Amino acid sequence: GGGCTLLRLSEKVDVIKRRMTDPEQQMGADIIKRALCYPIKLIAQNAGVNGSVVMNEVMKNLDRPHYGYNAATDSFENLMETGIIDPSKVVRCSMENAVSVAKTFLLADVVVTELKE
Amino acid sequence: ELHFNKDMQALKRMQAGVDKLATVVGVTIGPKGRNVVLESKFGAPKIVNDGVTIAREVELSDPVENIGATLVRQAAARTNDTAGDGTTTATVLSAAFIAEGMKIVSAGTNPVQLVRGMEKTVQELVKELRKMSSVVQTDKDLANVACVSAGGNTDIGSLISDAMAKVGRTGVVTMEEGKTAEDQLVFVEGMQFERGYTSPYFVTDPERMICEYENCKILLVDKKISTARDIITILESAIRGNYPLLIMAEEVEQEALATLVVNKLRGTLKVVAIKAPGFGERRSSYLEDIAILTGGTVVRDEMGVSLEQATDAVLGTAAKITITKERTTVVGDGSTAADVAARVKQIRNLQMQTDQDYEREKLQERIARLSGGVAIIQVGAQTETELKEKKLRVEDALNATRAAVEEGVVPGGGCTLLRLSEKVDVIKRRMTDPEQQMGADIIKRALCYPIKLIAQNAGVNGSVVMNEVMKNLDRPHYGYNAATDSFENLMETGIIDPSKVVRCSMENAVSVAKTFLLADVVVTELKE
Amino acid sequence: ELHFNKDMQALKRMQAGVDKLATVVGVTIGPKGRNVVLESKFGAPKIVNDGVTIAREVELSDPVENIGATLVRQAAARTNDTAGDGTTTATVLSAAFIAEGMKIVSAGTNPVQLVRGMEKTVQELVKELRKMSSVVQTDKDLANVACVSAGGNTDIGSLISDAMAKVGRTGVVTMEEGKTAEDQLVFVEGMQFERGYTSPYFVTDPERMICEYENCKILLVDKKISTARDIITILESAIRGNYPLLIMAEEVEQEALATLVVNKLRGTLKVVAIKAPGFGERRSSYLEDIAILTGGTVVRDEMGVSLEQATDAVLGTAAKITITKERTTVVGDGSTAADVAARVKQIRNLQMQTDQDYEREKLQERIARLSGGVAIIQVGAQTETELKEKKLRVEDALNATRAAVEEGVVPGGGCTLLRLSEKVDVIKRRMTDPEQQMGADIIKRALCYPIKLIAQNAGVNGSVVMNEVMKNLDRPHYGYNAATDSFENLMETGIIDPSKVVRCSMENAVSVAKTFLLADVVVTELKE
Amino acid sequence: ELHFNKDMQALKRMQAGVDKLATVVGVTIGPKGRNVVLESKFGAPKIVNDGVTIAREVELSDPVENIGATLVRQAAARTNDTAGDGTTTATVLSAAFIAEGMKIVSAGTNPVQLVRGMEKTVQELVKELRKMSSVVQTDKDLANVACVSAGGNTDIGSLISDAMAKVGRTGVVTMEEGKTAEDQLVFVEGMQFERGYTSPYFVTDPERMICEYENCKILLVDKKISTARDIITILESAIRGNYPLLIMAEEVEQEALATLVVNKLRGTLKVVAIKAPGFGERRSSYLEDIAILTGGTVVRDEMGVSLEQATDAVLGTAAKITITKERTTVVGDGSTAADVAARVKQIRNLQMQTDQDYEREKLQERIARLSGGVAIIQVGAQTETELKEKKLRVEDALNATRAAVEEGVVPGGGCTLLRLSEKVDVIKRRMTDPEQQMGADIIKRALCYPIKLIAQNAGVNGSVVMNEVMKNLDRPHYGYNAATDSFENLMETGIIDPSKVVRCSMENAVSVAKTFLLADVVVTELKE
């Protein structure tokens, strides 16, 4: 948990070369990358600490040994053994739905609305 | 249909509303307080000297600064209905923590570590406040405490003293006027509980907003009530004998509650609504404990009789009943006194065979209030405006004495807030981050505000008064009486505050200041 | 006709203007600095990468925030003409102290103890800066410093190295272009002083604003000058031979000064103004030290000849003279070199018979500059634009090398500000009042700003950069070069700053922040 | 008195102004270009089909978008005076780099790496353009290139062909009309230099802004001139004989220059001021190289005769002199032709004994221009409007032929931009950061703009045009002539552009786009 799983997910779109590798789809991949960076940034920031340095410490270190950052205690700790864990169902559903509404958002080009008079 | 308020200025907005509330209640505080004029609903205006009445009526225009002042009103009201006093102190301290809070926060300081510092500081200052407290253990010192806390002369405070000297602990003393000019002490079979009414619309006589009824029958069950036709038949029994009815069966749903308040608003049916004591098997063991005490059987389905009709056998009787916000009291009824003398025997038998721990203290708290009973006191009568003036004085006397004997006693005049303030300087916290230290200094400078406002609005500089007491030794009960304007010891003189008031107002003020500075976004429904 | 600006908000007004000045100069700083487009006075615009030019042109509409920005410009300009560089660093530091300062003052903190904490912190940080400094004592390490400090390749920086390896101390190296593509070193009879021009209107060629004249006569008297009729006869002596004239006789009053600038503006008379070196008997002993050095006599009334007609040998000759803001230099004249070799003998004579102390060092500072002379260097020429680009590169090279060897050298990139910032945490001051501690933390967070603005406007987060540098050992010259974006030691790589610049910009920034936060009331003339 | 513009929107303001300039110059481009109506200073309007006249006159109200458009005007003007043509191409490309640049920058992309990508991509494309270029080495193919580049028929372009076939390299061919209808080729003793006149106020006949004089004497010294009394005596020597005078002594200061332009504005004295060729000892070796050539001695103070008076012996003669922005040409004078034939012998002698390297090429560049001389051509005359129409057609012909033979030739129509644009897709840079790749793609989409605007304003979709040219093989000189609206090889048809124009307009466009996107803050002096 701690939204750190979104960083580990974001740092695996750099290895995704798609078909037919048109620059636009690559932009969308970079879009997902920078968008997954936001949640942990908001968590660390609104807690009271710079999120840029936290993101740097976790990412530069090995991403596999469950390295993470607990904002509740503010210290370098493994999220598993400490007790900060998130259900994968929540992460998956919130991620798919966010893209689903972003789909029907950016695709939009004309909006109508019934007015008062 | 929702308005948005964000950033740094949104906080300042409701802070101003808070500061405006603490401004009018601020000039209320002090022995030489000022008069606040209120525009009447219809007719001649009402002059106010109380901080409670002011906090009740204040509500501004701008919604953000309106919910800000109301957010402090919560702490003020909550402090009042849990300590009996200290609304003025709660508000001014609340705004003090907020003002000094916003002052430091504006320097880009982390709110989380600040509020953590405040929480721990006041918490240790509460632990320190218990050390500061002066305990009463003798009925004669209790007499001196009572008579002094009572307005003016002793005598009447000397009457309350022996009134509670009879019934040792667990209360509960109730007062009433009439009928002939003497001091009539009366002890009868009465009981109380720490539950409250269902709706604040049952208040018999404002502004006391306390529901009192004389010569009324009682009725109670354990299960939830929603059906009405059963009570309608009992309503016919309440019309059969034009008398009010008592009901306290845990949760009454919106249907029966609406029928109750409608039949009460017209005056056709005098009804009372309230909750059940305890939980689980305790409920069915508490209502049956008060059933026979009131001279009535139990209408539970466990045996079980529960139908449309209801006679005198299923409902007990109570001469007088007085219920308030968090308390419900019964007294006066001349029913089976042996029941009160036999149920206590059953508790002793159960406690003798009890191996558990929770059952020991539950039987201990039940044997307490049972044995304590109710004691009701009758006041004298000189003129028609005399006991009315007395009854109010003895009302404020009893509540003050109870609040004092409950948690202990501390030197009043707001000086106890100074002594508590000059002990945060030695507090080295963990992990001693600068932010938490700021919060400690915030508590320090905030505790300074009440005494300053007291002296200032009295007519003298508070800076010199604070300097005279602080530089002098804080231990020999040194203080400053604003009533006489002289250096005196607050204990021997007669200026004392109940420690319950100081603690509650302090904790609540930090409580609202916690959820005030922690806020960052405020929403509000708008007109259009 | 006078406007009154008071309270707390009047401070924030000029703070905004200060912050606006630091905003534009802020994006100027750093190796990956940004361009700032200036509107032309008439025609094609002018893009600027320097922080000096920007600070010259900035002046806001609102008077209060204009004089506030102008107040910072004072420290910026003063740093520029006392160190040679660091306008960008002085400004951002000045605003840093002001921003962080007012951030704390807003909490009602005592300004007096705050600025006291600032002054002492930076002063001990200057004493610490001298420890941080690296000293050059060998001409070969001086060669490596000079070449690296020079732009790009060495060769020319390797030429200035031996140029100052010849003239050991006291300077002073002066440069000039022409005529054939080689490296021509020339040592001749030249001298300089630490005085300046009378008026900034004498500047020959802006934006260098340095008055340079070739093949001109020089005139010196010790007393003050106010009369004109004597000068207009020398003007006739300056018209007889169409040549410029040099004058530095202490104080020239408004009358003669106005006549001088008027006759110079029309181009009829090429005149130069300036001031006198030393004081009292020193003046009459310094002007006669340069009179014969320029091949002229003294027109003092002590002997004394002083009439209307002045001739050829009452005024010395100087082949080339270059003067600036706080310096005045002469060079080139092929006069009595024996004088330069005989006056030094007279100084040694006075030195050995001297029993005093001040006379010993006055003779020592005079024998220094006299023996030092003025070595003029001639650069080569590939094309016509290459010689100009070189001349500018060697101009910035010489001024950088001089500013480096003068006060010592410190690691550049603004990283030395962090190493200094992480030494205030150990500073336990007297009497350690919290306010002075706030001032220390203010300096800390303020010294953090420059490196942040450099990294940020370069294109990378400054927080991570600060962390990586600070968490690592601060002693093995660890640093971060924004030009390459990589972990590197600032020394071996070639990113160095002169310690004189850091110190001057630091002290001045605190100096203006001193007179900024101490302010409480501001006045200003209005239009109507 | 200074305004402040910052953030992202400040960039878009001047970007709009740039977009407005490229809008009017945009409809100018193309064979089927449109007419731009200009309001006259006084009287009948002036229609313009040239992009040069438009770029001169355009200047908007809003200062920021004015200095933005002017910033592009600097690129267009600089391209014009360094290539001879391509103002329209420079502007549309400049705005292309800006538009496509800001289009990517708005995504928060690093400006530093972007412009770095732009610089390197276009620089390698310059190295690529030199590959795309076609070379001319035969006078007969030169004849075909010249006649085609010339408007319409050949004959006259076939005359310029043999005109330059005579004088091989180093130029320089000058033209003139009159007097009898034939083809008169004339070679005489003439010379030129790559220097320019002092002030643009000396222009004889606009809009050609080129100062031309007939039958005038010359005068040159090496030292700087500031005095005037010597000049006013030569003025008297220029008044006794009503003839203009030539002066080129390096730097003429503000005094003499002001006197010169004043005496010229009244028509009493026909003067001009020009700079010195070479540098140092070269100057004194170049002015005496043109002194005797013009039949005059040297007035240098190196020995050295220089006083008040001046006669015919100190000043040479010149039949005709034509000077422009960056060139100064003399021709026609019938002086010592033996001088031009003897100084070349002296150069060969010095060349034989020269051991250096720079002296060899300096003697080589002097022996070149000396041997090349200055061939002047005379055109025929049918009517009076035909000779002027010819003279204009041969003026643009000569300038086009020189620009084509100088840097080589490339297929015109802006199609060479596509061939250059479809070569950035193979450019893998270092360290191949995405930003530099964006800058490469920016260059690609920007090079697509000119050909698109050409086809569009002509009257055909540019999308299908780009498709046909690009999808086909880019090597067999495939192109699209908008004049005939048809598939055609740009070489064999007659639509060719000089490589110098394409290269210079491309480099300057990136240069101003460099100092455009790098900008982040813009300042501007306001009215009040």
CSV table of N, CA and C in Angstrom, one decimal, chain A residues 4-77:
chain,number,residue,atom,x,y,z
A,4,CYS,N,2.5,3.2,-3.2
A,4,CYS,CA,3.8,2.9,-3.7
A,4,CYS,C,3.7,1.9,-4.8
A,5,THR,N,2.6,1.1,-4.8
A,5,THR,CA,2.4,0.1,-5.9
A,5,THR,C,2.2,0.8,-7.2
A,6,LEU,N,1.7,2.0,-7.2
A,6,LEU,CA,1.5,2.8,-8.4
A,6,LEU,C,2.8,3.3,-9.0
A,7,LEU,N,3.8,3.4,-8.2
A,7,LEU,CA,5.1,3.8,-8.8
A,7,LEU,C,5.8,2.6,-9.5
A,8,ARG,N,5.7,1.5,-8.8
A,8,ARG,CA,6.3,0.2,-9.4
A,8,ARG,C,5.5,-0.1,-10.7
A,9,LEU,N,4.3,0.2,-10.7
A,9,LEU,CA,3.5,0.0,-11.9
A,9,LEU,C,3.8,1.0,-13.0
A,10,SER,N,4.1,2.2,-12.6
A,10,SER,CA,4.5,3.3,-13.5
A,10,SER,C,5.9,3.1,-14.1
A,11,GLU,N,6.8,2.5,-13.4
A,11,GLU,CA,8.1,2.3,-13.9
A,11,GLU,C,8.2,1.0,-14.6
A,12,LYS,N,7.1,0.6,-15.3
A,12,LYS,CA,7.1,-0.6,-16.2
A,12,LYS,C,6.4,-0.3,-17.5
A,13,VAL,N,6.2,1.0,-17.7
A,13,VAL,CA,5.6,1.4,-19.0
A,13,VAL,C,6.7,1.9,-19.9
A,14,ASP,N,7.9,2.1,-19.3
A,14,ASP,CA,9.1,2.5,-20.0
A,14,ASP,C,9.6,1.3,-20.9
A,15,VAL,N,9.2,0.1,-20.5
A,15,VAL,CA,9.6,-1.1,-21.2
A,15,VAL,C,8.6,-1.5,-22.2
A,16,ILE,N,7.5,-0.8,-22.3
A,16,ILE,CA,6.4,-1.1,-23.1
A,16,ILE,C,6.5,-0.4,-24.5
A,17,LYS,N,7.0,-1.2,-25.5
A,17,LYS,CA,7.0,-0.7,-26.9
A,17,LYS,C,5.8,-1.4,-27.6
A,18,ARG,N,4.8,-0.6,-27.9
A,18,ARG,CA,3.5,-1.1,-28.5
A,18,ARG,C,3.5,-1.2,-30.0
A,19,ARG,N,2.3,-1.5,-30.5
A,19,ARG,CA,2.1,-1.6,-32.0
A,19,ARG,C,1.0,-0.7,-32.4
A,20,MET,N,1.2,0.1,-33.5
A,20,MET,CA,2.5,0.0,-34.3
A,20,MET,C,3.5,1.1,-33.8
A,21,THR,N,3.6,1.2,-32.5
A,21,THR,CA,4.6,2.1,-31.9
A,21,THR,C,4.5,3.5,-32.4
A,22,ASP,N,3.4,4.0,-32.8
A,22,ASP,CA,3.1,5.4,-33.2
A,22,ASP,C,3.4,6.3,-32.0
A,23,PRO,N,4.0,7.4,-32.2
A,23,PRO,CA,4.3,8.3,-31.1
A,23,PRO,C,3.2,8.7,-30.2
A,24,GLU,N,1.9,8.7,-30.7
A,24,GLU,CA,0.8,9.1,-30.0
A,24,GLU,C,0.5,8.1,-28.8
A,25,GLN,N,0.6,6.8,-29.1
A,25,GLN,CA,0.4,5.8,-28.1
A,25,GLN,C,1.5,5.8,-27.1
A,26,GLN,N,2.7,6.2,-27.5
A,26,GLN,CA,3.8,6.4,-26.6
A,26,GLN,C,3.5,7.6,-25.6
A,27,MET,N,2.9,8.6,-26.1
A,27,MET,CA,2.5,9.8,-25.3
A,27,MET,C,1.5,9.3,-24.2
A,28,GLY,N,0.6,8.5,-24.6
A,28,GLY,CA,-0.4,8.0,-23.7
A,28,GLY,C,0.2,7.1,-22.6
A,29,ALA,N,1.2,6.4,-23.0
A,29,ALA,CA,2.0,5.6,-22.0
A,29,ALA,C,2.7,6.5,-21.0
A,30,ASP,N,3.3,7.6,-21.5
A,30,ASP,CA,4.0,8.6,-20.7
A,30,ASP,C,2.9,9.4,-19.9
A,31,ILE,N,1.7,9.5,-20.4
A,31,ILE,CA,0.6,10.1,-19.7
A,31,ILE,C,0.2,9.3,-18.5
A,32,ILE,N,0.1,7.9,-18.6
A,32,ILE,CA,-0.2,7.0,-17.5
A,32,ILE,C,1.0,7.1,-16.5
A,33,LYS,N,2.2,7.2,-17.0
A,33,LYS,CA,3.4,7.2,-16.1
A,33,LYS,C,3.3,8.4,-15.2
A,34,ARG,N,3.1,9.6,-15.8
A,34,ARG,CA,3.1,10.9,-15.0
A,34,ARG,C,1.8,11.0,-14.1
A,35,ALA,N,0.8,10.2,-14.5
A,35,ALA,CA,-0.5,10.3,-13.8
A,35,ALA,C,-0.4,9.4,-12.6
A,36,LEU,N,0.3,8.3,-12.7
A,36,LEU,CA,0.5,7.4,-11.5
A,36,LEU,C,1.4,8.0,-10.5
A,37,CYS,N,2.1,9.0,-10.9
A,37,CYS,CA,3.1,9.7,-10.0
A,37,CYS,C,2.3,10.7,-9.1
A,38,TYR,N,1.1,11.1,-9.5
A,38,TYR,CA,0.3,12.1,-8.8
A,38,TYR,C,-0.1,11.6,-7.4
A,39,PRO,N,-0.7,10.4,-7.3
A,39,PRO,CA,-1.3,10.0,-6.0
A,39,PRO,C,-0.3,10.0,-4.8
A,40,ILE,N,0.9,9.4,-5.1
A,40,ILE,CA,1.9,9.4,-4.0
A,40,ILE,C,2.4,10.8,-3.7
A,41,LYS,N,2.4,11.7,-4.7
A,41,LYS,CA,2.8,13.0,-4.6
A,41,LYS,C,1.9,13.8,-3.6
A,42,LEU,N,0.6,13.5,-3.8
A,42,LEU,CA,-0.4,14.2,-3.0
A,42,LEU,C,-0.4,13.6,-1.6
A,43,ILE,N,-0.2,12.4,-1.4
A,43,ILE,CA,-0.1,11.7,-0.1
A,43,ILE,C,1.0,12.3,0.7
A,44,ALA,N,2.2,12.3,0.1
A,44,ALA,CA,3.4,12.8,0.8
A,44,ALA,C,3.3,14.3,1.1
A,45,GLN,N,2.9,15.1,0.1
A,45,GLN,CA,2.8,16.5,0.2
A,45,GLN,C,1.8,17.0,1.3
A,46,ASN,N,0.6,16.5,1.2
A,46,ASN,CA,-0.5,16.9,2.2
A,46,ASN,C,-0.2,16.3,3.6
A,47,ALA,N,0.8,15.4,3.7
A,47,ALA,CA,1.2,14.9,4.9
A,47,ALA,C,2.1,15.9,5.6
A,48,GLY,N,3.0,16.5,4.8
A,48,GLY,CA,3.9,17.5,5.3
A,48,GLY,C,5.4,17.4,4.8
A,49,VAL,N,5.6,16.6,3.8
A,49,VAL,CA,6.9,16.3,3.3
A,49,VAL,C,7.0,16.4,1.8
A,50,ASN,N,8.1,16.8,1.2
A,50,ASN,CA,8.3,16.8,-0.2
A,50,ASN,C,8.2,15.4,-0.8
A,51,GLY,N,7.4,15.3,-1.9
A,51,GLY,CA,7.2,14.0,-2.5
A,51,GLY,C,8.2,13.7,-3.5
A,52,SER,N,8.9,14.7,-4.0
A,52,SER,CA,9.9,14.5,-5.1
A,52,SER,C,11.1,13.6,-4.5
A,53,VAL,N,11.5,13.9,-3.3
A,53,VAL,CA,12.6,13.2,-2.7
A,53,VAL,C,12.2,11.8,-2.2
A,54,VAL,N,11.0,11.7,-1.8
A,54,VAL,CA,10.4,10.4,-1.4
A,54,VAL,C,10.3,9.5,-2.7
A,55,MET,N,9.8,10.0,-3.8
A,55,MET,CA,9.7,9.3,-5.0
A,55,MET,C,11.1,8.8,-5.5
A,56,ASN,N,12.1,9.7,-5.3
A,56,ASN,CA,13.5,9.5,-5.7
A,56,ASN,C,14.1,8.3,-4.9
A,57,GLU,N,13.9,8.4,-3.6
A,57,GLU,CA,14.5,7.4,-2.7
A,57,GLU,C,13.9,6.0,-2.9
A,58,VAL,N,12.6,5.9,-3.2
A,58,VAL,CA,12.0,4.6,-3.4
A,58,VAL,C,12.3,4.0,-4.8
A,59,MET,N,12.3,4.9,-5.8
A,59,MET,CA,12.5,4.4,-7.2
A,59,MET,C,14.0,4.1,-7.4
A,60,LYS,N,14.9,4.9,-6.9
A,60,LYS,CA,16.3,4.7,-7.2
A,60,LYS,C,16.8,3.4,-6.5
A,61,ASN,N,16.2,3.1,-5.4
A,61,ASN,CA,16.5,1.8,-4.7
A,61,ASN,C,15.8,0.7,-5.4
A,62,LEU,N,16.2,-0.5,-5.1
A,62,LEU,CA,15.6,-1.7,-5.7
A,62,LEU,C,14.1,-1.8,-5.4
A,63,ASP,N,13.3,-1.9,-6.5
A,63,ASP,CA,11.9,-1.9,-6.3
A,63,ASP,C,11.3,-3.2,-5.9
A,64,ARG,N,12.1,-4.2,-6.0
A,64,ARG,CA,11.6,-5.6,-5.7
A,64,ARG,C,11.6,-6.0,-4.2
A,65,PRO,N,12.6,-5.6,-3.4
A,65,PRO,CA,12.5,-6.0,-2.0
A,65,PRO,C,11.4,-5.3,-1.1
A,66,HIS,N,10.3,-5.0,-1.7
A,66,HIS,CA,9.1,-4.4,-1.0
A,66,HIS,C,9.5,-3.1,-0.3
A,67,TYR,N,10.4,-2.4,-0.9
A,67,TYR,CA,10.8,-1.1,-0.3
A,67,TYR,C,9.6,-0.1,-0.5
A,68,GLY,N,9.4,0.7,0.6
A,68,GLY,CA,8.3,1.6,0.6
A,68,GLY,C,8.5,2.8,1.6
A,69,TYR,N,7.5,3.6,1.7
A,69,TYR,CA,7.6,4.8,2.6
A,69,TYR,C,6.3,5.0,3.3
A,70,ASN,N,6.3,4.8,4.6
A,70,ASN,CA,5.1,5.0,5.5
A,70,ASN,C,5.0,6.4,5.9
A,71,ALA,N,4.0,7.1,5.4
A,71,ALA,CA,3.8,8.5,5.7
A,71,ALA,C,3.3,8.8,7.2
A,72,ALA,N,2.8,7.7,7.8
A,72,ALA,CA,2.3,7.8,9.2
A,72,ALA,C,3.5,7.9,10.2
A,73,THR,N,4.6,7.3,9.8
A,73,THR,CA,5.8,7.3,10.7
A,73,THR,C,6.9,8.1,10.1
A,74,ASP,N,6.9,8.3,8.8
A,74,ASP,CA,7.9,9.0,8.1
A,74,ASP,C,9.3,8.4,8.3
A,75,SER,N,9.5,7.2,7.6
A,75,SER,CA,10.7,6.5,7.7
A,75,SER,C,10.8,5.4,6.6
A,76,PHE,N,12.0,5.1,6.2
A,76,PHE,CA,12.2,4.0,5.2
A,76,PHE,C,11.9,2.7,5.7
A,77,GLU,N,10.8,2.0,5.2
A,77,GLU,CA,10.3,0.8,5.7
A,77,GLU,C,9.7,-0.1,4.6
